[PDB]
Write a protein that binds this ligand. Structure first.
Ligand SMILES: COc1ccccc1C[C@@H](Oc1ncnc2sc(-c3cccc(Cl)c3)c(-c3ccc(OCCN4CCN(C)CC4)c(Cl)c3C)c12)C(=O)O
Ligand SMILES: [Cl-]
Length: 143
């Protein structure tokens, strides 16, 4: 399942570098990461209040808290329209949570969070993603 692997590589590396502040299909992945670095940080900067309010309401302190997020992520992501904008918001909130997790020394929860967001995205919408040319469509879309 190469789309799952490529989606996990991009989302994992984005969340990890947002948390740590430090950088680590080859071509697409690096272009897709570069785009998140641009659109993702814009989303977080622009929606800091809603993100912080949501995170405080979710009360995320440990691996059990993070593992219980998948349902609400699937409900909210599936509830609305599929477009790259809503995909980026999902990944941006993930990054915002990864940062919180690093702050409170729960950095070991960042990987299951990235796997959880990848499962949401690839398991609700792999057809749409295939039709859009997967990560190629994302890079063309955003530049
Ligand atoms: C540009 O769109 C933004 C930007 C900032 C916040 C909300 C949205 C709507 C967007 O949200 C999402 N789009 C795609 N995937 C997801 S997944 C998700 C979510 C929802 C709950 C839990 C978890 Cl783990 C994830 C939200 C999403 C959904 C709603 C949200 O906030 C709604 C406003 N509240 C008002 C009360 N206040 C205390 C907290 C903020 C937020 Cl912050 C998010 C991240 C969301 C979309 O649905 O297109
Ligand atoms: Cl296009």
């Amino acid at each position: 399942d190469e789309l799952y692997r490529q989606s996990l590589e991009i989302i994992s590396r984005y969340l990890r570098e947002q948390a740590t502040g430090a950088k680590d299909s080859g071509a697409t992945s690096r272009k897709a990461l570069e785009t998140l670095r641009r659109v993702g940080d814009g989303v977080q900067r622009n929606h800091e209040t809603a993100f912080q309010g949501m995170l405080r309401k979710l009360d995320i302190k440990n691996e059990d808290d993070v593992k219980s997020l998948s349902r609400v992520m699937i409900h909210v992501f599936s509830d609305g329209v599929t477009n790259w904008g809503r995909i980026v918001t999902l990944i941006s909130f993930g990054a915002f949570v990864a940062k919180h997790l690093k702050t409170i020394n729960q950095e070991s929860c960042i990987e299951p969070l990235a796997e959880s967001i990848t499962d949401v995205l690839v398991r609700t919408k792999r057809d749409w993603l295939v039709k859009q040319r997967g990560w190629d469509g994302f890079v063309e879309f955003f530049h």
